[PDB]
């Protein structure tokens, strides 16, 4: 029954994020759509598992156990936020509030993950098809049909193929791949990471140069946050930053200041991120990452 206490905690978060003092923007990730849509897909799951055996098998499904826990954990966390923050949660620019945006981002990724792992409410994690063949092979060789793996084990296996240089690189990596922030990597999270920092063959070097050392890279930011941040640099066209698309997981969203002072965001589709950044740089659109002068040379990744 732990799914019932999870809904109560979620309902509270929603009820609590409905407080119109927040002036929340209907813009993905929008918590007032995400949490009820999550309860709904959870409804859809319980209804597809319609008798006691099916409910028993579900209760033993490892991914689902981790999911419901995470979701309790995270729902508890958002409640804790509002209790500790109180007044600060009405301040657009408080850290308590940024924390809530982060959590909204986490719920959005969790929502999309459950719709990929339980499409229509039926479990198909063991048949999730990884998008890239090299990454696919790798998940296969080490984890077969698992839907979800603990970080440490993921890390140990990854390291046998693509070596991690140090502890803090491992931590920066975890933080990049563990989008749901539950200290596990699902096949879905892995699909996303391997799409973002393709090709598989040079994957950690791609991440190193596109994320770990790149000033333009923004972790856990929204569309609205990108726009507000580049607003500071609107007198310096060519200012840009990039991040994970929230509504098109596995792809990047590039935000830039145009010559006329507009903030546009664009999503590469065929072109991998590095070519998009080389192409943009050379035509004057992507010159100043996060408003800064030094723009990393990415030509070596071709």
């Amino acid at each position: 029954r732990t799914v019932e206490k999870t809904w109560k905690l979620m309902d509270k978060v929603v009820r609590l994020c409905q407080n119109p003092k927040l002036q929340l923007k209907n813009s993905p990730p929008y918590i007032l759509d995400i949490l009820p849509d999550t309860y709904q897909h959870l409804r859809l799951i319980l209804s597809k598992y319609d008798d006691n055996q099916k409910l028993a098998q579900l209760s033993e499904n490892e991914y689902f156990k981790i999911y419901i826990d995470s979701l309790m954990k995270k729902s508890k966390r958002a409640i804790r936020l509002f209790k500790e923050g109180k007044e600060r949660m009405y301040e657009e620019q408080s850290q308590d509030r940024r924390n809530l945006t982060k959590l909204s981002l986490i719920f959005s990724h969790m929502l999309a993950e459950i719709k990929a792992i339980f499409p229509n409410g039926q479990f198909q994690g063991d048949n999730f098809r990884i998008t890239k063949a090299d990454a696919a092979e790798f998940w296969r060789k080490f984890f077969g049909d698992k839907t979800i793996v603990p970080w440490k084990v993921f890390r140990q296996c990854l390291h046998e193929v693509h070596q991690i240089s140090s502890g803090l690189e491992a931590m920066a990596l975890k933080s990049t791949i563990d989008l749901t922030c539950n200290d596990y990597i699902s096949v879905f999270e892995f699909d996303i990471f391997t799409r973002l920092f393709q090709p598989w063959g040079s994957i950690l070097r791609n991440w190193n140069f596109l994320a770990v050392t790149h000033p333009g890279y923004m972790a856990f930011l929204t569309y609205d946050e990108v726009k507000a941040r580049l607003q500071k640099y609107s007198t310096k066209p060519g200012s840009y930053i990039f991040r994970l698309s929230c509504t098109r997981l596995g792809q990047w969203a590039i935000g830039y200041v145009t010559g006329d002072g507009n903030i546009l965001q664009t999503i590469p589709h065929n072109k991998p991120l590095f070519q998009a950044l080389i192409d943009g740089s050379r035509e004057g659109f992507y010159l100043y990452p996060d408003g800064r002068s030094y723009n990393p040379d990415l030509t070596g990744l071709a």
Binding site: L264, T266, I267, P268, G280
Partner: peptide, 10 residues
């Protein structure tokens, strides 16, 4: 244009 726009380089 919408929320996300076209590649500026073409």
């Amino acid at each position: 244009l919408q929320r996300y726009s076209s590649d500026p380089t073409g």
